[PDB]
Structure formats: structure tokens, C-alpha cells
């Protein structure tokens, strides 16, 4: 049984998701004095979270109905706070730095968890791990160079919260056998609840509605962005169903390279060659960790 459909699906869902995200965040709005840049990162994350929650509910209703979720409710909130914070920090970063920087920062996930395990928890790591971070750091340092700006601090906070979310998810999976769909649904529900509370409290839901009134065309794009975000995870899960995790690791590893490649060159940025080499070197750093698993 050939399985190109899942690989395709992922590469056609998350790729377009990135395209819509770039359009929504960095998209030029207005002319002259009408340059009202998209500063409403909370509302889009809220929409994405609710769409993900509904899709996960559908998947649960259609798959593994017999499974019983043993995870405690308060566990989901603890991971969800960092999950939501990581999204808010990452999406907000687009307000100050170009898309390639954000995606590369997202590819920098190993450093937080690796740093924690090696220096905070005092756990030795193999040689390959101790060199993956070095290669990635060299690549990003070359890429970055031509107090600090908000974009870099936002990216750092996003990485820290992503590491915290990863460790919390690891703990809950280990000690509660939480399913993929159940965790997705629950963390999305908690995130959307907290985001609704905050957004209505801060009031920019009204201001976001005003912005939509000024530019009505945004709503058709934000909905599609959320739908693609949900479908990406839905098809990622489908890969496990069709075939075991051996394919899941491969698809994740190849996506972590294809997404950055497309966002770098296929996005048609005005990148100078002096900068592209840095992307090349971080590529030579990226994936090398997956070489040793």
C-alpha cells in the first residue's frame, strides 16, 4: 500500500499554512498613512485554537472512541499556558522581524530542552547532541549578523516557552499515557478559553472587529489559515494510523527542512547572498541531529 498521500497532505497543508501566516502578519495594509499593520496576534491565535479544538473533537469522535483519557484536567492547563504563550510570542515576533527569522527560531527547538537537560538538570548528553546545538548556533549567528530589538527577545521567550511545553508534554505522556488527539483537543480548549478571557478583557476584540471593518478581506484568509493549521495536525495523526511512528519521525524530520527551505528561497525574500550562506550553514547543522536519532 503506497503512502504518498500523507506526505503530500502534510507538505501541502503546513506549507500553505505558512504562506497564509506570512500574508496575514507581514501583509501590507493600506497606503500612505493607512499603514495599519496587523498587531492583533491574540485574535488569530484564538481562532486557530478553536478551529484546532473542533477538528480534534471530530477526530476523537471518529477514531479510538473506546479510549479513556486518564490525564488530569489541571495538567492540561499547565501545558496550555506555555503553549498559548509560545504562540503569542512567536506570532508577535513577526511584527518586528522577517518571516525567515521566525521559522529559523522555530527550528531552534532543541536548544532550550538540551540546555535544560545538560546544565539545569545535570544530565550528560552524547557527542552528537553537544554538536547539533553548536552547528545551529553558528548558522543562526552567521544568519543574524550582516539592549537588543524586541524581535530577538520575543523569539527567545517563544523558544523558552516551547521548551517548557515540550517538557510538560513529555512528562504527561510518560506518566498518563495521554493520547495525541486528546492532548491536542484539551490544550486547544484551555488555550482558547484563556485567550477569550484575555482578548475580551483587553478589548482588542472590538478593535479587531473595527480593523476587519476597515479591511473586510482579512477574515477569508484567517479562517483558511486556521483550517490549514488544523488539517496539518489532522494529517500528521493520519500518518501514524496508516503506519507506525517510523514514518512519523521521517515526515517530521523532512518537514523541518522543507518548511525552512520554502520560507527562505521559495518565499522570494530580498535576501543577500552574504546572508543566505548562514541559512546554508544552519541547514548543515539542521538534520544532523536526526542523523543519530
Amino acid at each position: 500500500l503506497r503512502l504518498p498521500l500523507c506526505f503530500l497532505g502534510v507538505f501541502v497543508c503546513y506549507f500553505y499554512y505558512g504562506i497564509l501566516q506570512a500574508k496575514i502578519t507581514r501583509g501590507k495594509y493600506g497606503e500612505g498613512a493607512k499603514q495599519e499593520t496587523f498587531t492583533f496576534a491574540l485574535t488569530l491565535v484564538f481562532i486557530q485554537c478553536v478551529i484546532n479544538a473542533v477538528f480534534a473533537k471530530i477526530l476523537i469522535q471518529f477514531f479510538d472512541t473506546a479510549r479513556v483519557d486518564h490525564t488530569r484536567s489541571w495538567l492540561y492547563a499547565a501545558c496550555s499556558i506555555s503553549y498559548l504563550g509560545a504562540m503569542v510570542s512567536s506570532n508577535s515576533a513577526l511584527q518586528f522581524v522577517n518571516y525567515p527569522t521566525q521559522v529559523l527560531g522555530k527550528s531552534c527547538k532543541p536548544i532550550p530542552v538540551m540546555l535544560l537537560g545538560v546544565t539545569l538538570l545535570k544530565k550528560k548528553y552524547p557527542l552528537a547532541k553537544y554538536l547539533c546545538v553548536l552547528l545551529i548556533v553558528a548558522g543562526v549567528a552567521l544568519f543574524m549578523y550582516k539592549t537588543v530589538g524586541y524581535g530577538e527577545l520575543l523569539l527567545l521567550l517563544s523558544l523558552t516557552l516551547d521548551g517548557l511545553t515540550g517538557v510538560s508534554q513529555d512528562h504527561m505522556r510518560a506518566h498518563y499515557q495521554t493520547g495525541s488527539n486528546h492532548m491536542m483537543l484539551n490544550i486547544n480548549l484551555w488555550s482558547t478559553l484563556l485567550l477569550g478571557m484575555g482578548i475580551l478583557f483587553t478589548g482588542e476584540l472590538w478593535e479587531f472587529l473595527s480593523f476587519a471593518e476597515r479591511y473586510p478581506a482579512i477574515i477569508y484568509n484567517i479562517l483558511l489559515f486556521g483550517l490549514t493549521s488544523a488539517l496539518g495536525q489532522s494529517f500528521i495523526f493520519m500518518t501514524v494510523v496508516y503506519f507506525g511512528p517510523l514514518t512519523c519521525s521521517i515526515i517530521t524530520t523532512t518537514r523541518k527542512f522543507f518548511t525552512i527551505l520554502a520560507s527562505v528561497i521559495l518565499f522570494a525574500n530580498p535576501i543577500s547572498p552574504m546572508q543566505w550562506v548562514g541559512t546554508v550553514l544552519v541547514f548543515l547543522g539542521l538534520g544532523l541531529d536526526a542523523k543519530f536519532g
Partner: single-chain antibody, 235 residues
């Protein structure tokens, strides 16, 4: 489902010796690098007492003598300074598949021969075949609406355990697939009880039924047990 095999059926030990009990599962019980294994110690005519969950995670209050080991499909339990108290039966349980299964049990013998929950089982003793039956487990000192699983388990003659079913405090209930069409578990929170109803009990159902309180961590651990009620089905 997963079958657990305990190779040493009966172990003859002398006090002070180090004893190891082996338990092999049919399928890999590893889930995300965590073993979903538990161990229980049963004295004659007593409910099992929970000892270990996963790999070497000794339950609080258990002596330091016991230690679990092994991963994948093969597991072992080691008692290095064996003492008089440890002479009992030992059961290995897996919590990787929705039917939780216990091993046949390994029996040790010696040569030369309010801060808790009170569970109380009740039900008819002797029953004719084909009659519907209903056992009631009443809980005192705790509210079944608080966070704890409440399970019905049974033990046939020969000391073979079989997890019948359970109900969670949310009202979510899980059944043994082999018995999903013969039993039903319900609860009454007003009186703090839960009932197990069996339809058309046959001679094979003769056994001792326990109601237990369990908490999920590294699997399912039946920490608290009732005294158990004997049920005999005969014509």
C-alpha cells in the same frame, strides 16, 4: 489481549536469601519509554496489597527490600533480605491494554515446614444458574465523586485474578471486552455506593469479588481493596 506468564510457580526460600520473580508479557508493554507494570502481594485469605508501579517505583510505605527491574516484555521483582512477612503470593499486572490482566501468581514458601477509604462488598452468597445478580460496594470515609477510579475485580479458585470493570468519578466507565455484554456497572452517589450487575451467571462465575479504589499513574494501581465477597453459583 496481553498474557502474563510467571515462570516460577512456587519458590522455596530460606530467610535472608535474595529471591527474584520473573514475569513475561506477550506484547511489549513499553509505552513512551515507561513500563506499565504493577506488582501485588496477597497473603492467604486477604485482598492484594499494591507494592510497585512501573519499574522500581516503590509505593510509599512499602519496605525498601522490594525492587522492580526489567523493561520491554520481561520484568522481575527482587526481594534481597527476604523475611517472614514477605511469604505470600505475588502477582504481576500490566496496564497497557484496556483489559488489565494479572499473572497466574508466584507463591513463596519456607522449607522445613480514618485517613483512608473503607470499602464493603455485599451480595447473595449462593445463587442458582441463569439468575441475574447484583453486588453492592459501599464506600465510607470518602466520596466516590472525588478523583479516584472504582473497580470491580474477581478472583477464581486457584488464585487467578480478572479485572471485571471500573467507573471513574466523572461517571466514565470501562468494561472488560470479554464481559462487556454480560455485566453493567452503575453508581449511586447519594448513598455512596456502586453496583455491579451480572446477567445470567453461569457455573464459571464462582469466585471472590473485590471492589477496589485505584489511581492512574504509570498505569492503574489498585491501591485500596475491600474485604471481598464470596459468590458460589450452583444448581
Amino acid at each position: 489481549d496481553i498474557v502474563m506468564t510467571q515462570s516460577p510457580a512456587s519458590l522455596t526460600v530460606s530467610l535472608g536469601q535474595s529471591v527474584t520473580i520473573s514475569c513475561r508479557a506477550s506484547e511489549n508493554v513499553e509505552y513512551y519509554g515507561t513500563s506499565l507494570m504493577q506488582w501485588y502481594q496477597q497473603k492467604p485469605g486477604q485482598p492484594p496489597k499494591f507494592l510497585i508501579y512501573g519499574a522500581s517505583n516503590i509505593e510509599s510505605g512499602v519496605p525498601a527490600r522490594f525492587s522492580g527491574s526489567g523493561s520491554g516484555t520481561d520484568f522481575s521483582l527482587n526481594i534481597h533480605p527476604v523475611e517472614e512477612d514477605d511469604i505470600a503470593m505475588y502477582f504481576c499486572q500490566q496496564s497497557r491494554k484496556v483489559p488489565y490482566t494479572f499473572g497466574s501468581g508466584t507463591k513463596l514458601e519456607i522449607k522445613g515446614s480514618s485517613g483512608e477509604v473503607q470499602l464493603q462488598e455485599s451480595g447473595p452468597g449462593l445463587v442458582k444458574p441463569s439468575q441475574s445478580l447484583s453486588l453492592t460496594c459501599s464506600v465510607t470515609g470518602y466520596s466516590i465523586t472525588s478523583d479516584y477510579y472504582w473497580n470491580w475485580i474477581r478472583q477464581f479458585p486457584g488464585n487467578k485474578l480478572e479485572w471485571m470493570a471500573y467507573i471513574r468519578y466523572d461517571g466514565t466507565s470501562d468494561y472488560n471486552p470479554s464481559l462487556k455484554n454480560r455485566i453493567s456497572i452503575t453508581r449511586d452517589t447519594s448513598k455512596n455506593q456502586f453496583f455491579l450487575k451480572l446477567n445470567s451467571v453461569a457455573t464459571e462465575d464462582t469466585a471472590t469479588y473485590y471492589c477496589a479504589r485505584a489511581y492512574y499513574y504509570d498505569g492503574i494501581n489498585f491501591d485500596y481493596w475491600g474485604q471481598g465477597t464470596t459468590l458460589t453459583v450452583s444448581s
